[PDB]
Amino acid sequence: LFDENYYAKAVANIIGEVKDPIMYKWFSPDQIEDVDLQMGYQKTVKWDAFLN
Amino acid sequence: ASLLDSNFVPINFTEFVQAISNTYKQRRIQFYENLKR
Amino acid sequence: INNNLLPFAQAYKLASSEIIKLINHFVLTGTVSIQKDGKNQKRLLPNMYGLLN
Amino acid sequence: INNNLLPFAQAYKLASSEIIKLINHFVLTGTVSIQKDGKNQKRLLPNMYGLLN
Amino acid sequence: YSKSMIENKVFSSCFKSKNERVDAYSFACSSYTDKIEEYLYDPANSFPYKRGVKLVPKENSIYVEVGADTDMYGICVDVCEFSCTAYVLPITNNFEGYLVTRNPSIKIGEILDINNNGVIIKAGGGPPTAINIYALSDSFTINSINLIKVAIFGNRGLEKT
Amino acid sequence: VKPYACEKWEDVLIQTIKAINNREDVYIETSNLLKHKILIYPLNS
Amino acid sequence: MKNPQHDASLLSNSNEFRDKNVEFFASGGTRTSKFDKLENHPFLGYPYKRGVKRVIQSHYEPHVEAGGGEDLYGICIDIDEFSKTATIVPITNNFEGYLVAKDSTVKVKDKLIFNKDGALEKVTINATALTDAKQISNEVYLVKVAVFGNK
Amino acid sequence: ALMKNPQQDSGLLSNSIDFRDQNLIFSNSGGVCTSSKDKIENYPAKGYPYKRGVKLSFGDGTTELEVEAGGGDDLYGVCSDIDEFSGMATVIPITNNFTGYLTLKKDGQNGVNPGDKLNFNQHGELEKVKSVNAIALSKAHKLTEDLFIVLASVFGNR
Amino acid sequence: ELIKFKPSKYMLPTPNEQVDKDSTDVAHSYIDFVLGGLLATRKTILQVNIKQS
Amino acid sequence: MPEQIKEEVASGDKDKMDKIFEKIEAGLSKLELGDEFSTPMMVIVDPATSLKL
């Protein structure tokens, strides 16, 4: 792919020069978790237990 | 599959995008490792 | 989701967490109750005391 | 014989034959019942139909 | 109404007093060797969940409908709305759990009676009670439906006042 | 955390406990299981 | 007590297999089914082998104590002194066994009611006596009954 | 009649081709819809209390108690099966709900309809209506000129 | 346990495969990104606004 | 984010740090953390707020 896509090769070469986002300072490492989606909606289910 | 690995060679644009996402995740992990408060 | 039924592993994990919370409450206080008012306490045997009682 | 007790294999075979007869009747007619009159039908879910109904 | 009842924009906020939910597990104390039966219920007449029900033999099947203590067959403990099926604990078995009441102010230890709607009320209403029902806790409102913890153990020999 | 009546009641309490425990460590914890109760005890086995 | 623990100096001769089950320490029932419901409850006093009623009120959970009549809740068939608990068969479950009788007037074919002290007395009806009242010790009378509910 | 199984033999082979209305025989012991958590007892049998309400009957004292057909204020349970060789009757206590085919009194059997309240007579037969909660779930089915069976559900005492 | 960020793994900028080309020396490229994914429990964020008028 | 603790400082008290801190204390009291209160906290402010602080 790199032999054919000069733009992809340049993106891969210069991808490291972009600075990290500053929003990471506003969250703990455990608070962030990636998901696999581009556009749409996703449902999250939270389970709990109680004593009767 | 990460762009930070010099040995990695993508085959198609889908693999390139996956490598970009993995590189971003690794960079976030490194930033959180190096962060001091 | 409709029937509130879970796999055995998740159900056991949640139940164990709740029981650990109850054990911590008993250790700190010395009483066993599931109400916010602290009533309907389970009567306990003698020589069974917490830090507060 | 006096108590109408059978080996598990024979009992299972007879029960399976009866159940397959009921399944064939349901597939053909769209209703489930054990009466010749066709009454006392079991209520089924929507979008569950046979070739006759 | 229903039991499960919906997408949320945000999640809802100790272990104490977390059982006050309409869809909570009905049996406060369960036991194997408890007999549970399945019946059909009317999907447009009355929702039998957590209510006292009676057997109505219809021309197509035996249904369960909310009923009074005089002609009560048991207590409906759960419902499967997909199949519109009600699960009933017969009155011959003991019960200790949360049931639907219409009086928002009931104290602990009071004698209770089931009315025509399969609803817990105070036994002082006037109808002669025929079942042993006692309030194990104060009635609480979920915002609105009123619930109360009750213990039901068999029929009463002579109807009270 | 209210000012002592630039010193805090927590600081005064810590100093008082250090006066009696031979100036060892003093740990402060908050628990939602307690209501208008204060528990003080050593960590000696 | 159900099991009065006292040390002895000589062994007691126990070889006869008859008239050995009618005793105060014999807990449970003569005939029991696997599908019988048993509930453990905190108790006050000593309601062992007696009709138990549920008393509801620092607030504590409801307990059980010796009683009967319109307040009858169950029958106590076993007791644990260390945990201060009692095993109870609810009134909705039939029971067959030896229970405490008020006096020796109870005989076979007698309908019996649980009194305010949890003892069975002749005449709603609660039990049918199967044997005559037998004096285990002093004024303690045990009668075999088959509980069926309340009339 | 007096036997759960047909006393006489048969000269024909069953077709076994249909599946509808084949449970009306008198030999259909037990309940139509039974739970695994049902308490079942056994007792010595006095007479033939099969498919009838059973009450306790005692003797002088030399022999153990037994069960006989009956009802009313002395009703103890419902008999669902009988082992003839051992003379034993299977009893479901009145504290345990039962649903099945029971003998119906041959007096006004046509008036019995689903939803009609029933009660046990002095001979253990169900009759249209006191102290026992029993509800008919079907109509009377005639097996003999004097034998009628009805599907009923008994769920305790009133 | 109270606030969780669950962004799409394509949230950060990503080049697009399509490139606009013509007979001149100027080309065009596209960058894609994804927004959304913040989740929080009720009554856990304090937002204070100081009105200026 | 909806269903959170919103506090508003009036325009007359736009420069009153005492009033701003009173509103902050009210919001902190209205905060609900439950059993997860033992956690680090994060505060984000604007340059004017920092200058006042």
Coordinates of N, CA, C and O in Angstrom, one line a residue, chain A residues 7, chain I residues 19-28:
Chain A
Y7 N 0.3 9.5 -0.2 CA -0.4 10.2 0.9 C -0.5 9.4 2.2 O -0.3 9.9 3.3
Chain I
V19 N -9.1 11.3 -2.9 CA -8.2 12.5 -3.2 C -8.7 13.1 -4.5 O -8.8 12.4 -5.5
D20 N -8.9 14.4 -4.5 CA -9.3 15.1 -5.7 C -8.1 15.5 -6.5 O -7.2 16.2 -6.0
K21 N -8.1 15.1 -7.7 CA -7.0 15.4 -8.6 C -7.5 15.9 -9.9 O -8.6 15.6 -10.4
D22 N -6.7 16.8 -10.6 CA -7.0 17.4 -11.9 C -5.7 17.6 -12.7 O -4.7 17.0 -12.3
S23 N -5.8 18.4 -13.7 CA -4.7 18.6 -14.6 C -3.7 19.7 -14.0 O -2.7 19.9 -14.6
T24 N -4.1 20.3 -12.9 CA -3.3 21.4 -12.3 C -2.4 20.7 -11.2 O -2.4 19.5 -11.0
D25 N -1.7 21.5 -10.4 CA -0.8 21.1 -9.4 C -1.5 21.1 -8.0 O -0.8 20.8 -7.0
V26 N -2.8 21.4 -7.9 CA -3.5 21.5 -6.7 C -4.4 20.3 -6.5 O -5.1 20.0 -7.4
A27 N -4.3 19.7 -5.3 CA -5.1 18.6 -5.0 C -5.9 18.8 -3.7 O -5.5 19.8 -2.9
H28 N -6.9 18.0 -3.4 CA -7.7 18.2 -2.2 C -7.8 16.8 -1.4 O -7.8 15.8 -2.0

